[PDB]
Amino acid sequence: QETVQRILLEPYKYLLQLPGKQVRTKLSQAFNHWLKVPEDKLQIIIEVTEMLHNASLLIDDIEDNSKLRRGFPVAHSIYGIPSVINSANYVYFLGLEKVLTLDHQDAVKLFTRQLLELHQGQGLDIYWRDNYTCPTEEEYKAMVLQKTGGLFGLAVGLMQLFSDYKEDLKPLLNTLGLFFQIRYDYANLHSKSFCEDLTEGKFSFPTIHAIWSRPESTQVQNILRQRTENIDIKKYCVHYLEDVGSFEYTRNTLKELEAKAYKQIDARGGNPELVALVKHLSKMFK
Amino acid sequence: ETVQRILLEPYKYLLQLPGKQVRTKLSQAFNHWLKVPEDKLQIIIEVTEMLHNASLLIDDIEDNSKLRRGFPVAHSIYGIPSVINSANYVYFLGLEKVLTLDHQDAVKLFTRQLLELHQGQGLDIYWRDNYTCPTEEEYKAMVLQKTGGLFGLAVGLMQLFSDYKEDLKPLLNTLGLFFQIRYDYANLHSSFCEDLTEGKFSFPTIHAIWSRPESTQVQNILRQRTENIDIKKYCVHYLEDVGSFEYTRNTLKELEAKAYKQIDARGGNPELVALVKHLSKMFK
Amino acid sequence: QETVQRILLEPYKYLLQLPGKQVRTKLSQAFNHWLKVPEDKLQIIIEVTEMLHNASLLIDDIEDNSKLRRGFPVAHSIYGIPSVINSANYVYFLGLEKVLTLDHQDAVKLFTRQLLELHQGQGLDIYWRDNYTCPTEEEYKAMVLQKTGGLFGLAVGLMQLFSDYKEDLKPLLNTLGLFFQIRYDYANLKSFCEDLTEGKFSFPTIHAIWSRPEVQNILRQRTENIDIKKYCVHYLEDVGSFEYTRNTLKELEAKAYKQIDGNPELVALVKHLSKM
Amino acid sequence: ETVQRILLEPYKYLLQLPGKQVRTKLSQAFNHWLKVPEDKLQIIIEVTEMLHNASLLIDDIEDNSKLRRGFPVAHSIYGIPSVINSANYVYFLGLEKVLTLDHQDAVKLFTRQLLELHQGQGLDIYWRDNYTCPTEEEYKAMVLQKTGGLFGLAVGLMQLFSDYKEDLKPLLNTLGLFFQIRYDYANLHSKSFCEDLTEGKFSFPTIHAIWSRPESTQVQNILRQRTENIDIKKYCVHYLEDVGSFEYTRNTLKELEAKAYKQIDARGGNPELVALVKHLSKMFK
Amino acid sequence: QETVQRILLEPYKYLLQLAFNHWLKVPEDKLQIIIEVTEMLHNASLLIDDIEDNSKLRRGFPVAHSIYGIPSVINSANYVYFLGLEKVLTLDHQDAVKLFTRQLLELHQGQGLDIYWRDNYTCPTEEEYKAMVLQKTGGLFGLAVGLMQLFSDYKNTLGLFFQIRYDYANLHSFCEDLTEGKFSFPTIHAIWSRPTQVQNILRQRTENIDIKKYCVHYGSFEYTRNTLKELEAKPELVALVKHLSKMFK
Amino acid sequence: ETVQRILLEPYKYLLQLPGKQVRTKLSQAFNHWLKVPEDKLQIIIEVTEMLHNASLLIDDIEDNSKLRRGFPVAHSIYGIPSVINSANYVYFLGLEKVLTLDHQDAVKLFTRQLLELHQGQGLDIYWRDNYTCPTEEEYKAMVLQKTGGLFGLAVGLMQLFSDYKEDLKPLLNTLGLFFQIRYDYANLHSKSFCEDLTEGKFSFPTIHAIWSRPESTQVQNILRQRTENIDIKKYCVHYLEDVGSFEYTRNTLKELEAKAYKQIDARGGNPELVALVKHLSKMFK
Ligand SMILES: O=P(O)(O)C(O)(Cn1ccnc1)P(=O)(O)O
Ligand SMILES: O=P(O)(O)C(O)(Cn1ccnc1)P(=O)(O)O
Ligand SMILES: O=P(O)(O)C(O)(Cn1ccnc1)P(=O)(O)O
Ligand SMILES: O=P(O)(O)C(O)(Cn1ccnc1)P(=O)(O)O
Ligand SMILES: O=P(O)(O)C(O)(Cn1ccnc1)P(=O)(O)O
């Protein structure tokens, strides 16, 4: 009578069912080019990433109050908030249990570190959003390093524990995770489900640039406070962003991060497949 | 790194709340057999209490409560996202704090015990929100997961550091059942009948449901999630009418009896028996 | 099928459980010493009247949007509106089936007449209540004669089909069925004075509106406020629309003892029931 | 007695707005066998039209629909109490009108068949509101009672006055399931958008998805919400198509239409009815 | 730290991002104040009007209150009213203040009648309509040209209607007046020519597009042609009237 | 021209409501020094009452209050758009009544004082709706602008017509803080219920709690909620009373009253005011 496993884990399965690009899985596969972890241990780590990542996504969609993910209704929108919260937390501790494999003294300590950081960054994003105090660009980046840096750290760090590779590539991880989120944040605004970021009231990187670039106007802060689903107000806001030059700013900064991206990978070896991933991901702005 | 102050605000708010935390008093009341080293004892109490309060932060979100120990729920002030993320944060603060015990098996126990907790919680939520009332055996068996987790972490982690070898998991079972059933009964028989508004199948409502299969009112009242005082009062009168409270009391006096017997099998306890006596005064 | 009835009749059984004054069945017991209907036919008649009546209250509870019925939550508050609507309609036709006993060619005819009369009365009351046009005292009395007179007429008339008694009592049923409604509506002694919250035109409310052509607004509000209801009680109290209806109950009821003569059994019910 | 006008205002309104009125074509197409006298036939058609329209007035309250045939629901303009009482009134007016056929068996048939209607309704409402999905067999039985009731009243009341001795209960059954399953499919495959999902009612396709994939309690949950959200409804249709429920509802529909086609030959055939079933069968082409 | 001024006036400036400055004979040197003071008074009146009219958009841009929130835009707008009076304390003229107050009271009277008819569900007549419009749009015109006239010895009460152009342009962001529930001149004329349904559709305050098309169908818009070229008191102004009148052609 | 009645209907409504004459009392007690001519004084009092009540019409909209002087807000019955126009109308009716004062400085002082009122109002609204708690000093300055404006119009306008030339700005300020803090504390402490919390505005008692214990963002969050829930309000007031914010507010109130007396006596004294301020301070005994 262990159908309770299937029922308890149902919101999670639903989310996986929706196509998820699993770019991070492509990454891990292309980061074994440096790591070359035994397949048996690599499969276990990859399981922990997909589990932890999608669990964090389940929780995020509640806390971010989004309506859609990968084009399909969010898990709490169908299964109800309590079920998907508990479901996602369950997947967290299934991940820890799965990490008790590998038999490595360092896996659990690394695990707690990485999840702690993910939760700190995630908590900061919501704190700024809900307490209506915008961060500086540095604060935004530094938190993003924790927010997207968390899972990246679990993946690549867990691979480092079982590799005869001893170097220190966390610089590549920082630069990379900043490329991912800022690609996403720019991608959200520069295009139903239109400008969902504005409805969250979240401080995207572009809104942060417009907010600090022109302290003479308060609007964007106010547009964010409203949390409007109204199409016209959001269209105006992207108009404002463009007039203050923020999408341009994000392009410049994005090409910045990509330029640095190629540098410390060049210094970290060849890595052709990963570079190909990077180009493909940068294709949006051109 | 003052940022923790911000992240831990909902958790801190809940801890400010006066709660006897009698689970601590059951760790130190279970300290009569275990005689755990103090240095390890205080750190264990920290991790068990931490995990407990995180669970409560989540329960009030999932259970959609309005009040806890007389004070507004954390999400009611700080918002749902803030309290969710803070509580999940405190989970891994607990995982981190357990590593100080330096026991190779401490992490294993922490994991299994949390998985049991999440199974119990999920099961309760599944039944209530999916409108399938359980059998009394499914209720007891589940409660052992929902309430058994924290208890098992306490005594179970203490067990690694105790020269005592005997098996208290029987005593724990009886304890968790006596605790949860105590709260369910206390919740319906004393804001007022909050469990009915949650729509959850407490023990008494379950007994009424299966005892008289002819009717389906109880299920229908529960499905509503009603705040109406008149309907709620009707449900308690019907509940008393079928004798669901007499049954709940009786099973409680049953558990208390098995309790006393159980401790006596393991040596005998002056303090804990006094504790359970105090709690059993509730249905005096 | 099996157990299909248990699910469908659950609201109905729920209403039947609730302690009931069962004044219709006693008021029909009274008409036995006149009719002396055979036990075999009488039991079926009492069953059918209780059935149709209890359904009528279920629909009334929806239409009036009452919050309490016999001190216990209304059936739709527990089982939900669709469920109790369909169940109640069900017992309506179960009543028709039950009248297929008695083996009387005319029984179904009387049944049909009395039920359509009921809805005519109920529908008129609902129309005035929801469209804010107060009726004349005559329109009210005639309507109540239809509304409660419907059920009375099925009981006593169907009883008349099986009785060796050939006098007429329709004037009695007139006075009595009007006396019941004016007694109940007249009641204003929590759920206190819900009739005003319904927005219904009570007899006292009708007397108050017509006595001073210068109450309709408080009724239109349909307010649950205790203060609005209490103030409304003041405008009634100074309108004196109370002892006029109470008087009219002493007139109507007083008229009944004389119209009965005859029943002592009905007489005791009339005096006792009139104590308010 | 102009008060009947006010009492019958909701019922008159429903009769006003367009409506398939196809059931009248069913009765006509069954008189090709029954060859009922006009004097009795017109009265039976009046009784079926009345009772049907009343049942729809109540059905909207029970189903919480917003619209009928493109027009506001009766209770949305006249209010719940007014329409409830009006429809019940026309119910018993139907009883009075059937008493004019002067057949001793008509009332017994009326009571029986109306009981059938209310049992089916009660079952549909029960499963929907108490969150218990029914089996495909339970559903089919319910449809035979709910949609079978009135159709059986029409054809059976016609049967009281016909020298025809053939049995038609089998084709009645096949037809009523053709109606309910056709309407359910047409409701979900498309009017409004998936109005059945907003009711939360267990239609034929949704139950197929429920039992076909005992893994996912998604469908139960989307109905449970009674969501008006376009995105949830649209996703649910996506699921229903990927599970197979739609090809399956079609299959049972083409089977049913075929079985319809055989039972008419079993009764010698009916040109108009064959045309009716073909025309209605164009829906799932 | 006098940034509280920027904080106070932001809704106003926001509207300024977004113009008709009719020129007038015998202009005085110091008239910049008339042009500026009228600009302020107009934009403030517009901020409040967008609150009162419940508009969603202005000049293709969100309304101020949709961004800054009703209270902020209200207080800002009143603030700029009194900045207009304060700047009017310039010119050092004893009669300037009196002319200012009088004309502003006229503006508020006209507006108040408009909102009252709309919110009280009573249709206005073409007579009462023209009279009110003279106050609503005429008000600001008076501070402008009268204050300018106090410095020209060229001692004109013409009061040409603009609002009728606005009314037609709204109904010929779709049918925004119909969604507002305001009585445009065409709906008033249509209601009075053939006495019901117009009053009923307007009462709805519907955002529904289909109802709007139905209302657009109903034949009084030809009456709304009107047309007036009654200037010729005695160059640029004629060009203004010509350019604006192209709407009906 | 009966239309004026309709234009002033909201204004007339608020004036109809029974009201405290405390500001009129304040002015009548400042005439002991001012000794304004009756004829000019009466017009001054009319204009002060007008502007005050109009400002109240706007404040109830901006604070989104539900009740004023125990009776529903005017916009709740007559509607927002109507009440704004009424109040703005009353502004310039007040100015126009000041033009009868026939003094070159009357209008200049008037504009100055109205601008200050709108400066304070704006600050309150900005902090509330942008969620920026102010410092105690920023609050006091703001109170001087918002509550100080009308008082300043009063005694300043009378000072234009009084041979009294002694500096009364300090006593005015002490009065302004005394009133506003008296009102805020009175709003949160005793006797619909904690309405300020539902507004989310930073009253003095709430600000002391916010800055006194920066370790917790509760009060900022409760204010952000704008909650009508009675339980949260009761918790929050308990929180203040535990953090000691009430006691702080009382102390600043009694200090203010003391400085008041000093500043009356040091101005030649007064009998009418000394009595008024004592009566007001009995409230926080
Ligand atoms: O922007 P978010 O952080 O919410 C997101 O990137 C999700 N997420 C969650 C944690 N890290 C990233 P998404 O925009 O996909 O909803
Ligand atoms: O009944 P719950 O599980 O919600 C409860 O017992 C909390 N809880 C949750 C897990 N263990 C205990 P509480 O009655 O305290 O609301
Ligand atoms: O006042 P009502 O008509 O509703 C009433 O008399 C019920 N009723 C309904 C129809 N006939 C009688 P009751 O007081 O029982 O609620
Ligand atoms: O879905 P229902 O069965 O209620 C329906 O088919 C009506 N109905 C009522 C009885 N039988 C059928 P409709 O879709 O028209 O609302
Ligand atoms: O409709 P209104 O008259 O209010 C308007 O013309 C503005 N207005 C306000 C006063 N006078 C003119 P607009 O249509 O631009 O919103």
Ligand SMILES: O=P(O)(O)C(O)(Cn1ccnc1)P(=O)(O)O
């Ligand atoms: O709190 P406010 O500042 O709005 C107030 O004091 C009104 N007010 C506004 C300006 N001056 C005083 P009230 O509490 O009476 O609503």
Ligand SMILES: [Mg+2]
């Ligand atoms: Mg996020």
Ligand SMILES: [Mg+2]
């Ligand atoms: Mg997200």
Ligand SMILES: [Mg+2]
């Ligand atoms: Mg994103």
Ligand SMILES: [Mg+2]
């Ligand atoms: Mg729980």
Ligand SMILES: [Mg+2]
């Ligand atoms: Mg709980």
Ligand SMILES: [Mg+2]
């Ligand atoms: Mg409990």
Ligand SMILES: [Mg+2]
């Ligand atoms: Mg009634």
Ligand SMILES: [Mg+2]
């Ligand atoms: Mg009733």
Ligand SMILES: [Mg+2]
């Ligand atoms: Mg009554």
Ligand SMILES: [Mg+2]
């Ligand atoms: Mg339906």
Ligand SMILES: [Mg+2]
């Ligand atoms: Mg239905």
Ligand SMILES: [Mg+2]
């Ligand atoms: Mg259908």
Ligand SMILES: [Mg+2]
């Ligand atoms: Mg306008």
Ligand SMILES: [Mg+2]
């Ligand atoms: Mg306007």
Ligand SMILES: [Mg+2]
């Ligand atoms: Mg216009």
